[PDB]
Write a protein that binds this ligand. Structure first.
Ligand SMILES: OC[C@@H](Nc1ncnc2oc(-c3ccccc3)c(-c3ccccc3)c12)c1ccccc1
Ligand SMILES: OC[C@@H](Nc1ncnc2oc(-c3ccccc3)c(-c3ccccc3)c12)c1ccccc1
Lengths: 303, 303
């Protein structure tokens, strides 16, 4: 009836891996940096180890397992995949370490050294990952610069599948209920009707691109989430970033059409950004890529 | 009778240049970082501005002017040259800013990123500068890693001519009297008889090279300057640095022969280090240029 999910859920022993340092700790528990050393092999795999707050909330324990189900069911160079789980007091999620952290923080603390080639290549990679998830029938529902991690400066992967949902063969959209989704990244239909689709992800992809192009600006910086619904209905959108040619900014605007089907598909976004990646300075204008009368002393020969 | 020194001593107005920041302040007064803006031109020259301690010692004021005389009389890509002096309360020496500071500090705080190409190229450049000073009939008497400055990582210049002395046409050596010269960089004959020659500079060049090859180690670290004379007489020399092939270390040892004329000339040191610079990894072994079983998670495919 539907394609049976034959993903393997690997169960890891706690003695196999070693926590080196804490990486971060929000309201989702704590993420550790560590090494995973399978006893049989002669390998040492750098891993990120996520566990919820020491306590046990019935609902929160289930949701980590949902995140495990989706991560275990994905396999793509531009998507983060689960290595396994460890069944300790609280369940631990284990994945490949992305040492350079989330892309939002990366663009912020490297503004001065990020060229148009990297920006456009990241857009291509995120589009490929999202396109893969579309093929896998998966709606992410939380795509943002913060949920894209950096393996190396030239290789990024999508992560954070805690809100992700699998769509059936005879199913085109997901209907939420609980809410509490980041308002500033979601499509109008999702705010107005809690409808989520692959094209809702495209909206979020648009906002994710805006983040990258503005080197990590906060969308609608001065605006409270209550108003967001209203301003979108009126036709107001995120502004054109300084470095963005109309060509690039038109792609972003297309992701934010009211009609979801009028928005571009991830496969089309791969093509368009790929074309642009071939001649990146034609599409992004960055000054890099306090005086200009300065001359070195051994070019100023004595008069 | 002797070649008349027709060097031009430029006198600069204080209003022409602007102190931005203090760079350092030992027992030689203070060195400022600044910009020099000749009124007529549309240029802004980055300069280092040296002045003695606010007060006026009769002997100390003379010695700054001696340093000005020698710096003003030199013109070579690998030697620091005086731009001018400013006749304020205390005399100010003005020269080209070498933004990366002295080479001793540079090798120390970049151990991990200094390759054999840079090390050997620096040796060539210092040899060229010293060879130029030899042609100019100038004995430096204070060559060390600390007295070589860095314009860029790939371009260094010799500086600090406070102890330098001009030799006459019919003159092969200088006889000091006051003393107080860095003992660990000077040749045996200079310690034993206060004799200084171009070949005494070669000894110091040998020690300067040892500093670079050991990434800024202090020569005879545990030894007090009183003993230095004795250990050299016995035949003890600075040890072979870990990264140094016998080829390179033999050059260093040759600079430390008792017979000054047995030591190599700077022109020969230019040639030898130049040859080596063409195939630098044959002559310096640096690991760059905590586990080795580490494999990235997306090269460890699930068994
Ligand atoms: O977002 C959850 C995701 N976290 C990471 N995953 C891989 N590699 C990472 O690297 C950093 C990281 C590395 C260096 C500096 C900062 C962060 C974080 C990570 C850690 C804390 C919060 C968010 C991401 C991180 C995760 C998901 C499932 C299982 C474990 C971990
Ligand atoms: O050694 C005296 C020499 N000094 C420098 N000269 C050029 N460029 C420099 O750059 C730094 C420097 C720059 C950045 C960090 C640290 C040092 C120093 C310099 C400053 C203080 C002591 C020694 C050298 C320095 C000098 C000689 C004559 C006139 C002025 C200055």
């Amino acid at each position: 009836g539907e394609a049976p999910n034959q993903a393997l859920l690997r169960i890891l022993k706690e003695t196999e891996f070693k926590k080196i340092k804490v990486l971060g700790s929000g309201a989702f528990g704590t993420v550790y940096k560590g090494l995973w050393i399978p006893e049989g092999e002669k390998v040492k795999i750098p891993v990120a180890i996520k566990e919820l707050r020491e306590a046990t909330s019935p609902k929160a324990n289930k949701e980590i397992l949902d995140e495990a189900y989706v991560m275990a069911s994905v396999d793509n160079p531009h998507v983060c995949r689960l290595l396994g789980i460890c069944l300790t007091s609280t369940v631990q999620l284990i994945t490949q370490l992305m040492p350079f952290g989330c892309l939002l923080d990366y663009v912020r603390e490297h503004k001065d050294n990020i060229g148009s080639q990297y920006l456009l290549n990241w857009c291509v990679q995120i589009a490929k990952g999202m396109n893969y998830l579309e093929d896998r029938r998966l709606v992410h529902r939380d795509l943002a610069a913060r949920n894209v991690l950096v393996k190396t400066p030239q290789h990024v992967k999508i992560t954070d599948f805690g809100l992700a949902k699998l769509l059936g063969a005879e199913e085109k959209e997901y209907h939420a209920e609980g809410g509490k989704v980041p308002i500033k990244w979601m499509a109008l239909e999702s705010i107005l009707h809690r409808i989520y689709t692959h094209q809702s992800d495209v909206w979020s992809y648009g906002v994710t691109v805006w983040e990258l192009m503005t080197f990590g600006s906060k969308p609608y910086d001065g605006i409270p989430a209550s108003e967001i619904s209203s301003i979108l209905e009126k036709g107001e959108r995120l502004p054109q970033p300084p470095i963005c040619t109309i060509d690039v900014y038109m792609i972003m605007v297309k992701c934010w059409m009211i009609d979801a089907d009028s928005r571009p598909k991830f496969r089309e976004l791969i093509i368009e950004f790929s074309k642009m990646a071939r001649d990146p300075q034609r599409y992004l204008v960055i000054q890099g890529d306090d005086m200009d009368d300065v001359v070195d002393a051994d070019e100023y020969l004595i008069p």
